[PDB]
Design brief:
It is classed as membrane protein. The structure is cut from a larger assembly and holds chains A, B, C, D, E and F. Chain C is mostly helical. Helix content of chain C is 60%, strand content 0%. In chain F, helix 1 runs antiparallel to helix 2 and helix 2 packs antiparallel against helix 3. The chains are: A mainly alpha, B mainly alpha, C mainly alpha, D mainly alpha, E mainly alpha, F mainly alpha.
């Protein structure tokens, strides 16, 4: 009974929920030049065809 | 040094991609698949011997309309972004007197000439937009060489909307028959039409639409620099 | 390659380069206006037939000898598109220094 | 009809030295203001080169729009 | 008939008559907007019942010049439907903004709104690629001026990144137009698709890639999106609807129009395999960034991006069984996102702000406006016999024959995440209240609810509405019956 | 000549483009923007389309460059990149 599954699913959901706080701050910045760099990266992928 | 050099690498591969993509033709002749119809049918289908004034107001007739929509939206956007009910000048810091008198006498010299540009879209190049922009330049010369020069706003943007309406009322009374149909040279609606072909009797329909659009874009940028030269 | 192709794509190149690496906001708007200028330069430099040339006379010059009557109508809007967009963005460039205290993209924190 | 053109190109890239170097804030301004008049004199010259009566109609319009620009550049410097 | 060409001219003449009556008084300024968009619903309904009367669209000419030398407004089976739904949504906005936005100079806001309606009926009626660009820039500068119209610092910067990103995208779009014209020489899409099979295989690739690119920037997928959950957070409350309802759909349609105009060339398959991947990358990031979200206007702003990403998922996958069902999401998510930004707008105008701390406790405190947010938030995961359930089932079944089980297990993953941040919101407004302040708001207690009864009737009767998008998929599925119904 | 002055104008436009973004003084950036509008107008005229040349003359010379310094009037003039105790933090 020391190895429950109630604990593991709360662990995996808290990991997804803190990844939700992770992707919020990384991709969605206040830096305008970050979005310019995102546009230049996807344009570079269009170069790569 | 990381960001600048890495940007130069990616922008070099962008420019190489466009230059490899620019392998269509080395400035050759074979380009007009529909463009020959614009040239060979411009002297008898509109009246304006000008090429560009007949294609952008008659042929691509909903594109100077989107253009004046864009300029009017720039006016109302800057006016909505700057609104304080006070609207005073900066410090006005006079500076010279051969400048105020310099732009005084020169103000009708550009007012005569800017009108000359948009009335003549027949043998002269251009259209309504360079003449309207230099009418706005004359407004700017009187606006950047005096201590106030506030043209009265209540009674200023009225004629801008009136000139845009004057474009669209030629589309709406143009809807008396068909889509556009010029209302002016092909049917004796208000006056005559198609006298000869050169600067005799103002060609077809294209001059009066350029007077109206030149009046609209003439009061366009002058309003923008007006409500952007206003402090608290 | 011809000089017009390279020069119109390098003006777009420099206007693009002045959006990524530069940090002051009005320098970014300078990059936007430069890139729009190079864009309408490319928009003209597509239809030059290397030869016969009088787009607007049609009186002293014979017809079927003018250059590219399609892109000259594409550029008559697409230039003043740029000055209307720049006049719109300049208002925001004024408001951002009025309401906040600076004009650098790393310091503007809402 | 032809030699003058290359002379004006020599003139304008020789005026380029003032906008590249020059430590002051206004030597660049005196660089651009003179660069417009030499290119106006270029723009009148090509009317001979292409034999067109309409190519002078852009030259005088550019003879206005230099002067408004250089007043506006040299008015914030005073106020 | 060209008598129905007033979908652009009537908003134009009224937006040029509203600065004529701005000095004639103050009374008939904001009531000038309601009667004109009611006339817009009338001229839309004329075209709507005339398009579905016969099997032929109205080839609204630009004068006495037959296409391709002129401009054609191919108001197809798609276009009359979308002009109708934008007319009815703008009429729902005009009877909303009469007493909800008067904080700021509405002296000039009316023309900005109506010019957005002009860009609306221009963008989903365009035939020329030039007119496509011009109407998109009308909508773009409309959005530049109207997401900035609060002047509060956080709202001033909210436009700035969008004006510089929409500037760079419109720039790239004109380069792509210059290259497609550089190979062919024609502009009208009728004469373009019959020609673009053997123009040049190495020139059409860069032009099509950059056209899809520069048309994507004003819309949203992954890179060029983060201005949008900055624009909905900081704008006037009625235009957050008209952006989230409309402007995403015009961009996603005109992207998916012109992509299905070149469906014969090489390199196109890698382009739609990128567009699948970026649409899946935006159903995950947008609808998972709303999980730890504090501002409730942002909590819906992220949700509206994730619903348009799955529209992009099926708008460019194949040809059928999902493009005609991808439209079934665009005419459906506009209504349910009209419901969302109504309730958030009414909270932000009644109580004040959109923080959860001043959003908490609306079960007993607020009337059935909170029930409208309830029945709206129920219909984004699509749990009961509702309409987003029907539509999202049509989109997930669309991602079967091509691009399967990875571009399913991310969009369908997001609806598991979107299941979380709604019932962390509906719970804290119905069963946490402890505050009985009656605060009567019976001015939208009927109008939003007749809208809320419009999603309950499509939820039980989809087959009176799913037969429309079968004949309204015929403008995007093919080229041959499209071209032959022009020339 | 024919093509040599074209190469001169286009390299002058490029060197006025690169040096339009390298400077920190924003009034100098308006100078560089005005010179770019100069060489664009000359290239429009040399590519034989006078309509766009005179329109860009009336737009980019003193309605795009003289609206920009018009905006830096009540704003910064430098980059303001800064010696110091609590600096570059």
């Amino acid at each position: 009974l020391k190895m429950s599954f109630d604990r593991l699913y709360h662990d995996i959901w808290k990991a997804i929920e803190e990844l939700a706080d992770l992707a919020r701050s990384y991709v969605y910045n206040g830096n305008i030049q970050a979005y310019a760099w995102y546009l230049a990266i996807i344009l570079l992928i269009l170069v790569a065809m | 040094m990381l960001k600048r050099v890495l940007a130069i690498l990616t922008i070099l591969v962008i420019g190489y991609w466009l230059a490899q993509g620019l392998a269509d033709v080395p400035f050759g002749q074979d380009k007009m698949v529909v463009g020959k119809y614009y040239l060979e049918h411009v002297k008898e289908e509109t009246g304006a011997v000008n090429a560009v004034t007949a294609v952008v107001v008659n042929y691509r007739g909903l594109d100077t309309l989107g253009e004046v929509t864009v300029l009017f939206i720039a006016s109302t956007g800057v006016a909505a972004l700057l609104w304080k009910k006070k609207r005073e000048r900066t410090a006005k810091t006079e500076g010279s007197v051969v400048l105020t008198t310099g732009a005084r006498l020169l103000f009708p010299f550009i007012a005569l000439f800017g009108m000359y540009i948009f009335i003549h879209g027949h043998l002269t190049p251009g259209g309504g937009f360079p003449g309207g922009a230099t009418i706005a330049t004359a407004f700017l010369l009187m606006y950047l060489a005096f201590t106030i020069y506030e043209i009265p706003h209540r009674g200023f943007e009225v004629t801008e909307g009136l000139a845009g309406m004057g474009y669209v009322i030629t589309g709406l009374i143009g809807l008396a028959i068909g889509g556009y149909f010029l209302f002016d040279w092909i049917w004796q609606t208000w006056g005559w039409g198609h006298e000869n072909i050169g600067r005799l009797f103002s060609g077809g329909f294209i001059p009066i639409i350029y007077t109206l659009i030149g009046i609209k874009v003439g009061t366009e940028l002058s309003g923008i620099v007006d409500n952007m030269l206003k402090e608290e | 390659i011809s000089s017009y192709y390279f020069g119109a794509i390098s003006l777009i190149l420099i206007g693009l380069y002045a959006v990524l690496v530069k940090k002051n906001l009005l320098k970014i708007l300078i990059g936007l206006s430069i890139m729009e200028t190079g864009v309408n330069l490319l928009l003209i430099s597509i239809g030059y037939v290397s030869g016969k040339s009088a787009p607007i006379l049609s009186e002293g010059v014979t017809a079927s000898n003018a250059v590219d009557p399609i892109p000259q109508a594409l550029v008559l809007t697409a230039i003043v598109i740029g000055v209307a967009t720049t006049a719109m963005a300049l208002s925001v460039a004024i408001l951002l220094y009025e309401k906040y205290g600076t004009l650098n993209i790393e310091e503007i924190r809402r | 009809v032809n030699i003058y053109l290359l002379l004006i190109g020599v003139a304008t890239l020789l005026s380029m030295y003032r906008v590249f170097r020059g430590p002051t804030t206004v030597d660049r301004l005196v660089a651009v203001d003179i660069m417009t008049t030499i290119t106006v004199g270029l723009m009148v010259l090509f009317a001979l080169y292409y034999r067109r009566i309409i190519f002078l109609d852009v030259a005088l319009v550019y003879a206005i729009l230099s002067f408004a620009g250089v007043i506006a550049f040299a008015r914030y410097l005073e106020g | 008939s060209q008598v129905a060409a007033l979908l652009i001219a009537l908003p134009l003449i009224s937006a040029f008559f509203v600065p004529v009556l701005k000095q004639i008084g103050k009374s008939l300024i904001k009531p000038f907007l309601v009667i004109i968009t009611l006339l817009q619903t009338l001229i839309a309904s004329w075209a709507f019942v005339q398009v579905y009367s016969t099997g032929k669209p109205i080839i609204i000419y630009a004068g006495g010049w037959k296409p391709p030398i002129g401009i054609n407004l191919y108001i197809g089976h798609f276009a009359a439907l979308f002009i109708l739904v934008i007319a009815v949504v703008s009429f729902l906005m005009a009877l909303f903004n009469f007493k909800a936005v008067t904080v700021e100079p509405i002296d000039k806001y009316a023309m900005l709104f109506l010019l957005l309606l002009l860009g609306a009926t221009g963008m989903i009626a365009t035939g020329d690629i030039f007119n496509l660009f011009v109407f998109m820039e009308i909508t773009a500068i409309s959005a530049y001026a109207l997401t900035a119209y609060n002047k509060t610092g956080e709202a001033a910067e909210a436009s700035m990144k969008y004006i510089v990103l929409g500037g760079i995208g419109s720039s790239f779009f004109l380069v792509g137009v210059a290259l497609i014209y550089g190979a062919t020489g024609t502009l009208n899409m009728a004469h373009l698709a019959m020609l673009a099979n053997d123009i040049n295989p190495t020139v059409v690739q860069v032009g099509l890639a950059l056209i899809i690119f520069g048309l994507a920037v004003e819309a949203e997928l992954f890179p060029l999106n983060a201005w949008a959950p900055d624009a909905y957070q900081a704008a006037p409350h009625p235009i957050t609807v008209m952006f989230s309802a409309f402007v995403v759909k015009a961009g996603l349609y005109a992207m998916a129009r012109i992509l299905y105009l070149f469906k014969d060339v090489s390199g196109w398959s890698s382009l739609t395999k990128l567009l699948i991947a970026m649409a899946t990358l935006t159903v995950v990031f947008a609808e998972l960034s709303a999980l730890r979200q504090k501002n409730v206007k942002r909590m819906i702003a992220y949700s509206s991006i994730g619903q348009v990403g799955l529209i992009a998922l099926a708008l460019s996958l194949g040809t059928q069984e999902g493009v005609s069902a991808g439209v079934f999401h665009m005419l459906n998510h506009a209504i349910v996102k009209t419901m969302m930004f109504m309730a958030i707008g009414y909270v932000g105008i009644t109580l004040g702000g959109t923080m959860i701390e001043n959003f908490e406790g609306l079960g007993k405190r607020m009337p059935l406006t909170s029930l409208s947010l309830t029945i709206g938030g129920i219909a984004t995961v699509g749990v009961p016999l509702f309409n987003v359930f029907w539509s999202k089932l049509r989109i997930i079944l669309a991602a079967a024959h091509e691009g399967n089980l990875w571009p399913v297990a991310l969009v369908l993953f997001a609806s598991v995440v979107e299941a979380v941040y709604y019932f962390r919101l509906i719970h804290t407004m119905w069963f946490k209240g402890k505050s009985g302040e009656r605060i009567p708001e019976g001015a939208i207690a009927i109008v939003l609810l007749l809208l809320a009864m419009l999603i309950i009737v499509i939820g039980v009767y989809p087959t009176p509405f799913w037969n429309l998008v079968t004949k309204a998929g015929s403008d995007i599925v093919e080229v041959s019956k499209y071209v032959a119904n022009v020339l | 000549c024919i093509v040599c002055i074209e190469y001169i104008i286009v390299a002058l436009m490029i060197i006025s483009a690169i040096l339009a973004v390298e400077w920190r003084d924003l009034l100098a950036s308006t100078v560089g923007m005005a010179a770019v509008s100069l060489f664009a107008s000359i290239l429009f005229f040399f590519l034989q389309a006078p309509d766009v040349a005179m329109t860009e003359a009336a737009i980019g010379a003193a309605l795009s460059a003289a609206v920009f310094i018009f905006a830096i009037k009540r704003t910064y003039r430098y980059e303001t990149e800064e010696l110091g105790w609590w600096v570059r933090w």
